Amino acid sequence: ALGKLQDVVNHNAQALNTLVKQLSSKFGAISSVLNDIFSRLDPPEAEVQI
Amino acid sequence: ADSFVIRGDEVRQIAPGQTGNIADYNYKLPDDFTGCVIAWNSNKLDSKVS
């Protein structure tokens, strides 16, 4: 009977979860972790991937 | 204008963000370098029979 309130809660949680899930996407780069990007290859391309 | 003389295959080490003996011990270029580099062979003037 209270699903009108529950939705308001749920729509918040999803909105945050999606945000967190965007921290593990490569966006076309070699990897998701930027420290490995800095430690692997030269600055000329490190700038591009960063 | 910075002038010097080096060995052959080390010529690649004169560039921003490069690793090698010359880059890390003798002549280091900034990562934000703007300029030009000119390298040519001088086997006739810098070589001796002895």
How far apart are the C-alpha atoms of B35 and B37, rounded to whole Å?
7
CB contact under 8 A, B18 and A42: yes
The dihedral built from the CA positions of residue B11, B12, B13 and B19, taken in this order, carries a sign that is negative
Experimental method: cryo-EM
Q: Look up residue A6 and give its amino acid.
A: Q
Resolution (A): 2.7
Q: How many residues does chain B have?
A: 50
Are A16 and A28 in contact by the 8 Å Cβ rule? The answer is: no
Q: Which residues of B touch A38 (CB under 8 A)?
A: none
Helix (H) or strand (E) holding A19: helix A3-21
Measured from the Cβ of residue B49, the count of other Cβ atoms closer than 10 Å reads 3
CA distance A41 to A34: 11
A43 reaches B (C-beta below 8 A): yes
- CA B6 vs. chain centroid, Å, equals 6
Do A28 and A50 meet the contact criterion of CB atoms below 8 Å apart?
no
The residue to which tokens 């000329």 are assigned: A44
Using the Cβ of B8 and the Cβ atoms of chain A, whether some distance falls under 8 Å is answered with: no
**Cβ density class A2-41: b for 16+ within 10 Å, e for less:** eeeeeeeeeeeeeeeeeeeeeeeeeeeeeeeeeeebeeee
Q: From CA B8, how far away is CA B20, in angstroms rounded? A: 13
